[PDB]
Symmetry: C2
């Protein structure tokens, strides 16, 4: 009955709602032994909240990986990874480990309807991460990028994107719709290569949702590590994060985090599952 | 009302049992909003477990502090701070903040210490701002100038001296270092000495015990416990984590930070001495 060891490869969100902070918090909430290999530190200007991303040098990244690999993770999550070099190493680290689960959160920086800073990072994710992924967890924008379809606007568009992403090698795909899709219920689309499942909760408040995405992928990872099937794990993750969102709060004018502990301390949220 | 915002100023322990990892995990267990300003990254050799400390640039340290100060912590903990500059900055961020609680874990590196100047810096910059200072038995001897402490009476003398150097509340941990049948710590508020006692648990897998104790103290303060109640509750919390420590490899094993809530509570005896 030893704690499962869960590693995230991610950066530091100094505001502590997303990034590796959300990951370690979530892993802790879900009774796993959380670990991080840090890639970068993100800080925010006191006056304007402008973000500054400081990459960490590859040598300290590699030293962290050595320690983490030695410990031996049971599951690995990737968060926002800054370079193709790190994207490639993240996949290699998973294959070198005895970890049984790989959750890829394919985080991208969005510049427009259909635009990212460097599409090479998307290509690298496709090449190096998707074919190793137990679960890939794009948001609606990211799913359009990974599938090459551009803007997705419907469940039907999500089904098409999920097919394409699955076919790039991810064993399981969850495309999150959420606020980006509809304002009345929060829809995500899960696909296992055989059946498309719509996942639903109510739409909750949209003001304070910082860290929702990271938390979702973190929870998926921990639930896999603790023995839930991929389908079970993403359902449970959606519930976990829905409670966190419902219980989000205002930290300052710029950030309102999800309450990562809300599932366990406040309330559970039921997820409706329907074949579509 | 809202979750209390608790900041730790500490390095990353890649093995994830101590350092900022223990802090954030403990803060989360105790229903606070944990934050970190990272000072350094510590890694371990896969074959010997020898530590390698990589400092973070001061400018990234400073930019993290600016973000955290803007958010406005309710409580701040200091973990192992490697330089006089960082020690001084830590005290300054607390005084600039509207935080009501400052918990100083006066971590020293045994050689005698590496960096005796850092002991002097902690005394100058941190002790007079500390709500609670949490030296282990070695550190208490260093802070007090008494040298090696080996009894509750020695701890009483050290706590008096440390209080007189400006710390509002002092908890000197005895624990396995004091090496008695039970695990004793000593709390002092300038008026009364309280001995805190638990069972002495296995000693092999105790990595992160010190960090976890200070982190728990900080979260308990932030959530409304008095300093005395906070250190009693922290000892119970860490005692369960220690009881439930586990083997990571042939060189280390961490405490189970979640044990108090997931597994069991541990009783703390409180007596005036
Ligand atoms: N306001 C809201 N109400 C209910 N569910 C929501 C919601 N906003 C998002 N969701 C759900 O939260 C999960 C995460 O969705 P998404 O990937 O869009 O997170 P995010 O980008 O808003 C946060 P971050 O980037 O700060 O870590 C999905 O399950 C989605 O359906
Ligand atoms: N094996 C054990 N059984 C019970 N209590 C213990 C213990 N080891 C430490 N403690 C307690 O754990 C807390 C932290 O103690 P302390 O800071 O002395 O850590 P430590 O024993 O790790 C010294 P170091 O950091 O040098 O390894 C204190 O409350 C102390 O009493």
């Amino acid at each position: 009955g030893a704690l499962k060891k869960v590693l995230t490869i991610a950066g530091s969100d100094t505001s502590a709602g997303a990034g590796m902070q959300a990951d370690l918090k979530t892993f802790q909430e879900l009774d796993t032994y959380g670990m991080v290999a840090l890639t970068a530190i993100v800080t925010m200007d006191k006056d304007t909240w402008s973000h500054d991303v400081t990459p960490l040098p590859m040598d300290v990244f590699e030293k962290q990986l050595e320690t983490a690999l030695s410990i031996g993770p049971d599951a690995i999550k990737t968060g926002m990874l800054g370079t193709e070099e790190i994207i490639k190493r993240a996949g290699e680290v998973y294959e070198a480990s005895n970890a049984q689960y790989f959750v890829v959160d394919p985080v991208m920086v969005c510049k427009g309807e259909d635009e990212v800073l460097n599409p090479g990072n998307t290509e690298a994710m496709i090449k190096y991460l998707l074919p190793k992924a137990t679960v890939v967890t794009p948001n609606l924008f990211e799913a359009g990028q990974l599938s090459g379809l551009g803007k997705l606007n419907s469940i039907e568009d999500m089904k098409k994107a999920a097919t394409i992403i699955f076919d790039k090698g991810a064993q399981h795909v969850i495309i999150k719709g959420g606020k980006a899709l509809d304002q009345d219920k929060s829809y995500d689309l899960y696909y296992d290569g055989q059946t498309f499942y719509q996942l639903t909760t109510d739409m909750f408040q949209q003001s304070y949702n910082h860290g929702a995405g990271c938390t979702f992928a973190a929870a998926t990872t921990a639930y896999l590590a603790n023995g839930k099937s991929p389908k079970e794990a993403v359902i449970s993750a959606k519930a976990f994060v829905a409670s966190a969102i419902k219980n989000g709060w205002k930290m300052n004018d710029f950030v309102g985090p999800v309450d990562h502990g809300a599932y366990n301390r406040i309330e559970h949220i039921d997820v409706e599952v329907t074949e579509v």
